[PDB]
């Protein structure tokens, strides 16, 4: 936990500094509200079990930012490949993530840091 890691002189992770698991859960919920209300994106998730996705994304986002959480989903390249996702789509999704972070009160500097961890994933997520 954060306390245990601090007693062992480990640096504070992005996960811990934005409020850990509960912060990620709040942000992911908001994020998908934003994504599904965007006409340019909603169709990608037609028929997708959103309850299930949100759970995987909470795990994935937590793990990526330094949480202890198990990621239980499939690899990014295999999940997204062939879905006709372009950098324009990727960027919109990253935009909604930034907007959810802002709405949750995450300092802009830390959102930029989070996008620096996420942006590289575009190589696996896009086909365009
Ligand atoms: C920004 C970086 C992204 C991350 C970290 C991410 C993460 C994830 C995760 C964890 C899953 C769940 C995989 C599983 O079920 O095992 C997933 C699935 C999915 N993602 Fe993404 N994603 C990203 C970008 C995008 C974009 C840009 C789109 C479309 C514009 C997209 C559309 C989808 C779809 C359609 C699924 C599968 C839902 C289903 O199985 O029906 N993702 N993604
Ligand atoms: C992908 N959400």
From Swiss-Prot:
Keywords: Heme, Iron, Metal-binding, Oxygen transport, Transport. Heme binds at residue 80. InterPro entries: Globin-like_sf (IPR009050), Globin/Proto (IPR012292), Globin_bac-like_CS (IPR019795), Hemoglobin_trunc (IPR001486), Hemoglobin_trunc_I (IPR016339). One of its GO terms (molecular function) is metal ion binding. Its cofactor is heme. Binds 1 heme group per subunit. The keyword Iron applies. The keyword Iron applies. Homodimer. Binds oxygen cooperatively with very high affinity. Belongs to the truncated hemoglobin family. Group I subfamily. This is Group 1 truncated hemoglobin GlbN. It comes from Mycobacterium tuberculosis (strain CDC 1551 / Oshkosh). The gene is glbN.
């Amino acid at each position: 936990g954060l306390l245990s890691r601090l007693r062992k002189r480990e640096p504070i992770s992005i996960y811990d500094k934005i409020g850990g698991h509960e912060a990620i859960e709040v942000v992911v919920e908001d994020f998908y509200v934003r994504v599904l209300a965007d006409d340019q994106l909603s169709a990608f998730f037609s028929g997708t079990n959103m309850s299930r996705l949100k759970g995987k994304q909470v795990e994935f986002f937590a793990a990526a930012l330094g949480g202890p959480e198990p990621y239980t989903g499939a690899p990014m390249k295999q999940v997204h490949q062939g879905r006709g996702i372009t950098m324009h789509h990727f960027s919109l999704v990253a935009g909604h993530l930034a907007d959810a972070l802002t709405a949750a009160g995450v300092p802009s500097e830390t959102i930029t840091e989070i996008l620096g961890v996420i942006a590289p994933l575009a190589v696996d997520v896009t086909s365009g």
